[PDB]
Design a protein around this ligand. Structure first.
Ligand SMILES: OC[C@H]1O[C@@H]2O[C@H]3[C@H](O)[C@@H](O)[C@@H](O[C@H]4[C@H](O)[C@@H](O)[C@@H](O[C@H]5[C@H](O)[C@@H](O)[C@@H](O[C@H]6[C@H](O)[C@@H](O)[C@@H](O[C@H]7[C@H](O)[C@@H](O)[C@@H](O[C@H]8[C@H](O)[C@@H](O)[C@@H](O[C@H]1[C@H](O)[C@H]2O)O[C@@H]8CO)O[C@@H]7CO)O[C@@H]6CO)O[C@@H]5CO)O[C@@H]4CO)O[C@@H]3CO
Ligand code: HEM
Ligand code: HEM
Lengths: 448, 448
C-alpha cells in the first residue's frame, strides 16, 4: 500500500477534450499504439472523463467478471446516450430488474422459436431481393438494414405487428435510435440537453402499435407460440406479470439492440466474401453439399451444419465487431495487472482490439475463416474473442443473430453471386455513430 | 516487461529549476512530505537533472550495495563540486585506484596511532580553550572548526606540518573547500565554469608545505610512527610506491573530508548538551565514574568506556548528520521497490531522512541518546542509521572522528559547563553549503 499505483496515464496537450480527437479520428489505431507504449492497462482523458482500458484477455477479465455495483453500466449513459427500450424497462430500472427482463427475453429466444423463424426470414429475404432484378450494382448495407428491420420485426414481434410495418413505420424506427449509445464515450453525462422530440414522438407512436397488438393477443387466445407470447406468460421472481408497457418496451429495445449490430456485420461479410471469390463459391458449394443440390426451403437443422458460412460470420465479427467498446464506471477500487483503478474511471474493453491483438492472432488483419480450425485465442484464451461480450456480460440475442444472418446470407448467396466494384474494398467509416462500411455499393448477378 | 514502470514522478511547474527551490529552502521537509505522498521510491527534477530517492532501509539498500560501475560516484561532480584531494588522487583517477588509496589511508587510521592522537588532541583542546577565560559567551562552531583544523592537522599530518600551521596557512585551508561538494545537487555538471583561482592557488601553496615535509622524513629515518609514515611505506597491488603528489593529495583530501563534517557535529552536540542540562552533568559525572575523580590526562582505553558520551555523539549524528545526501549516477538500469531506475537518473539516499523516518524512530525529533539502549532501527535494520554510509560505501575516517570528537568533548566538558543563551536552541541553516547551526554562540562557565 502506497497511494498512487494506478495505471500509466497518457497525457494530452488539449485541456478538456484530451484524446477525444485522436480517438475520434481512428480509435483502434489509437488503442493499438497505446498498447505498444503502455502495455495492457492504461488511462487517458477524453472530454473531461478518465478512461482506463483493459487490453488483452488477462486484463479484460476484470470487466467480464465484474458486478454491476463495482463496475457500473447505467453510469455510462446520458438521457441521450441511453440505449432505447422504454419506461420501466432496462436502464430506466435497477440492474437486478433489468437482468430479470433479459432472462425473460432469453427464454423467448429458444430453439423452438428459431425453427419457425428460419423460414419466415428466408421468405422475407427472397421477397425483398426480388426487386433487385437479374443484376446491377446496389448498396448492400442499405438493403440489409432495410430487410433486417422486416425480418427481425416478424420473428421478434409476430405477424400482427409485422403486417402494420409499412415504410411510414419503418421511418419511425429510424427516428428512434440515431445510434447514440455508441457515442457515450464522446458525450459525457453532465451536459445540459433538450428533450429529443423526434425520438420521444416515434417511441410514443411505435409503442402505440404494440398496445393495439397486445390487446388482440390477450383477447382471442389460440395456438400462437411466438416471443410475444413467452413474454405475456412470463412473470418476475415477484410473481407479478409484465405490464403492457414493459412488454412493448423490452420488445422495442430488443429489435433495436440487434438492428444496427446485424446490418453492419451482414454488409461486412458480404464484402469479405465478394473480395475472396474462392471462399464465396466454396460456401455456395457447401450450400449444396449440406442442403442438397435442388436447394430446398431452408431449415434450422441445416443451419447447424453450414460450418464454413458459420466461420465466415465468426471471422467477420472478429475483424468488424459492431460493438467496439464495452464500458463500465468504477464505483469501488479495482485491481488489474498490478494496478488499482480508482472509483471514478470509466473502465473499458474493446472487442475490436482484443480480436486483432498483434501477439495473439496470427495474420491479425486477414480474413481467414479457417483460422478457427488450427489453434487460436478464440478457444485458446477466455477473453480474446468477445464480440458478444463474455462472463456475466454477454449479448442475450447472440443466437438469434446467427440464425438471422446465416439464413439471410444463405438465401442471398443462393440468389446471387457478388463482387467488389473496382477492386474497391469498403473502408471503415468512424463518422457514423456505429462504424459503417464506406460506400457499400456491391456488384451482384444471378447465381449458376 | 512493459516499458515505463519507473518510480512515481513528482511534477514541478518550474520548467528547468523544477523543485530546486523547494528542496533548496528545506530539503528534509521536502523529502518527508514526498515520502508521505509517493512512498519509499520516487523521482523529481532539479536544475535539469532527474533525481530518484531511496527512502527507508529496504530501498536505501540499492545504493549501499551498488558497484561504482552501475551507480557512479564521479559522474555526480563538476570541476567545482569535486571533493578536493589532488592530482592523481581520488576523483581525479579511476574508482578501483581511488579505492586502493582509501585502503592505504584506512590502514593508516588504526588503534596504534589513535592511542598517540588522544593525548595530542587533548593538549591542543586544552591550549586552545585557555584563551576563553573563566566565562563568557562565544561561538562554539567557529571555535570547534578553528580547533579541529589544528587537532586533525597534528594527528593526520604529523608535528612537522602542524608546526608550520600558523593562521596564514589556516586561512589557506579555508580557501580550499568552500564546501562545494555538498552543493552538487544544485549545480549540474554541464555548466561552463572559470578556473577557481583562489582554490587552485591555495592548493598549490599548501601542497608545497607537504613537499618540504615529505623531504625531511625521507631523509633522516628515525622512530617516527605516524599516518604520514604508513603512507610512504605503502604501495599498490602494483608494488609501485606513492609519488610525492599522491601522498600530499590524499592527506589534504583526508583532512578536508573530515574538517567540516566534524565541526558541524561537534557544535550540534554542544548545543544538545547545553539544552539538556541533566544529560550534560550526567556524562560529566561519567567522566569521573570512568576516568577517576582526579581526572588524569586522557587515554584511548578510557574512551572505549565513555558509553554515554558515546551515545550522545551517536545521537547527535542521527539528528544532524553533516552529509545529508549520498548520490550516485545510474549507468545501467536498476530495480528497487518494484520499479526500474533508467540509466541517467541520480539515485540518492538521505542519512538525515532515514534517521528520522516517522515509522522507524519513536520520538523521531527527540534528542534521547538512551534510545539505543532499548530497541531501535540502528541495530534493528541494516540501513536506517547510516551517517557514515554503509555497505560498500562507508566513511574510512569514521573511527578517527569518534576519537577526535570524544576527546575534544571530554576535555571541553571538563574545563566548562555549557548552556543556551536565552533558551535559544540553534536552528538549522541550509544557506551554507554544509548545513550549519544558526547563531551558534554558547554560554560557558568553568566547571565544578
Ligand atoms: O505524478 C504525476 C503522474 O505520474 C505518472 O505519470 C507517469 C507516466 O506514466 C509516464 O509517461 C511519465 O510521465 C511523462 C509523460 O509520459 C510525458 O508526456 C511528459 O509529460 C508531460 C505531458 O506530456 C505534458 O502534457 C505536460 O503536462 C501538462 C498537462 O498537459 C496539463 O494537464 C497540466 O498538468 C496538470 C494536469 O492538468 C492534471 O492532470 C494534474 O495531474 C495529476 C493527474 O490528475 C494524475 O493522473 C496524476 O498523474 C500521475 C499519473 O497518474 C502517473 O501515470 O497526478 C497528476 C499530478 O502529478 O495536475 C497537473 C498540474 O501540473 O499541465 C502540465 C504541465 O505542467 O508536461 C508533462 C511533463 O513535463 O513527461 C512526463 C515525465 O517527464 O512518467 C510518469 C511517472 O509518474
Ligand atoms: C450482430 C451481432 C451482435 C453483436 C456483436 C452484439 C453485441 C452485443 C454486446 C457486446 C452487448 C453488451 C453485453 C453486455 O454488456 O451485457 C450486447 C447486448 C445486447 N444485445 Fe446484442 N449484439 C448482436 C446482436 C443482437 C441481436 C440480433 C439482438 C436481438 C435479438 C441483440 C440483443 C441485445 C440486447 C437486448 C442487449 C442488451 C442491451 C444493453 O444492455 O444495452 N443483440 N450485444
Ligand atoms: C564527522 C563525522 C563524519 C561523517 C558523518 C562522515 C560521513 C561520510 C560519508 C557519508 C562519506 C561517503 C561514503 C561513501 O560514499 O563512500 C564519507 C567519506 C569520506 N570520509 Fe567522512 N565523515 C565524517 C568524518 C570524517 C573524518 C574525520 C575523516 C578523516 C579522517 C573522513 C574522511 C573521509 C574520506 C577521505 C571520505 C571519502 C571522500 C569522498 O569519497 O569524497 N570523514 N564520510
Amino acid at each position: 500500500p502506497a497511494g498512487v499505483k494506478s495505471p500509466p496515464y497518457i497525457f494530452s496537450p488539449i485541456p478538456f477534450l484530451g484524446h477525444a480527437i485522436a480517438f475520434g479520428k481512428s480509435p483502434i489505431e489509437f488503442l493499438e499504439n497505446a498498447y505498444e507504449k503502455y502495455g495492457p492497462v492504461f488511462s487517458f482523458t477524453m472530454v473531461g472523463k478518465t478512461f482506463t482500458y483493459l487490453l488483452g484477455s488477462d486484463a479484460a477479465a476484470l470487466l467480464f467478471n465484474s458486478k454491476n455495483e463495482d463496475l457500473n453500466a447505467e453510469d455510462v449513459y446520458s438521457r441521450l446516450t441511453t440505449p432505447v427500450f422504454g419506461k420501466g424497462v432496462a436502464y430506466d430500472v435497477p440492474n437486478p430488474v433489468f437482468l430479470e427482463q433479459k432472462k425473460m427475453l432469453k427464454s423467448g429466444l429458444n430453439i423452438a422459436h428459431f425453427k419457425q423463424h428460419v423460414s419466415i426470414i428466408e421468405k422475407e429475404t427472397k421477397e425483398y431481393f426480388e426487386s433487385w432484378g437479374e443484376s446491377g450494382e446496389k448498396n448492400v448495407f442499405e438493403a440489409l438494414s432495410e430487410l433486417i428491420i422486416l425480418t427481425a420485426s416478424h420473428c421478434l414481434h409476430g405477424k400482427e405487428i409485422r403486417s402494420q410495418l409499412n415504410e411510414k413505420v419503418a421511418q419511425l424506427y429510424a427516428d428512434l435510435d440515431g445510434g447514440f449509445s455508441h457515442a457515450a464515450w464522446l458525450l459525457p453525462g453532465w451536459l445540459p440537453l433538450p428533450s429529443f422530440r423526434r425520438r420521444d414522438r416515434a417511441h410514443r407512436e411505435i409503442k402505440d402499435i404494440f398496445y393495439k397488438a397486445i390487446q388482440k393477443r390477450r383477447q382471442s387466445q389460440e395456438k400462437i407460440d411466438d416471443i410475444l407470447q413467452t413474454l405475456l406468460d412470463a412473470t418476475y421472481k415477484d410473481g407479478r406479470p409484465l405490464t403492457d408497457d414493459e412488454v412493448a418496451g423490452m420488445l422495442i429495445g430488443l429489435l433495436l439492440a440487434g438492428q444496427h449490430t446485424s446490418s453492419t456485420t451482414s454488409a461486412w461479410m458480404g464484402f469479405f466474401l465478394a473480395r475472396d471469390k474462392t471462399l464465396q463459391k466454396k460456401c455456395y458449394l457447401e450450400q449444396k453439399t449440406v442442403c442438397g443440390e435442388n436447394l430446398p426451403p431452408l431449415t434450422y437443422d441445416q443451419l447447424k451444419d453450414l460450418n464454413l458460412l458459420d466461420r465466415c460470420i465468426k471471422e467477420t465479427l472478429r475483424l468488424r465487431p459492431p460493438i467496439m467498446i464495452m464500458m463500465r464506471m468504477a464505483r469501488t477500487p479495482q485491481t488489474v495487472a498490478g494496478y488499482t483503478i480508482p472509483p471514478g474511471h470509466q473502465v473499458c474493453v474493446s472487442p475490436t482490439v482484443n480480436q486483432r491483438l498483434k501477439d495473439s492472432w496470427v495474420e491479425r488483419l486477414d480474413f481467414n475463416p479457417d483460422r478457427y480450425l488450427q489453434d487460436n485465442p478464440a478457444s485458446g484464451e477466455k477473453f480474446a474473442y468477445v464480440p458478444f461480450g463474455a462472463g456475466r456480460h454477454r449479448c442475450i440475442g447472440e443466437n438469434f443473430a446467427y440464425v438471422q444472418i446465416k439464413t439471410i446470407w444463405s438465401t442471398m448467396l443462393r440468389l446471387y453471386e457478388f463482387d467488389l466494384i473496382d477492386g474497391y474494398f469498403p473502408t471503415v467509416n468512424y463518422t457514423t455513430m456505429i462504424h459503417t462500411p464506406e460506400n457499400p455499393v456491391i456488384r451482384y448477378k444471378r447465381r449458376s
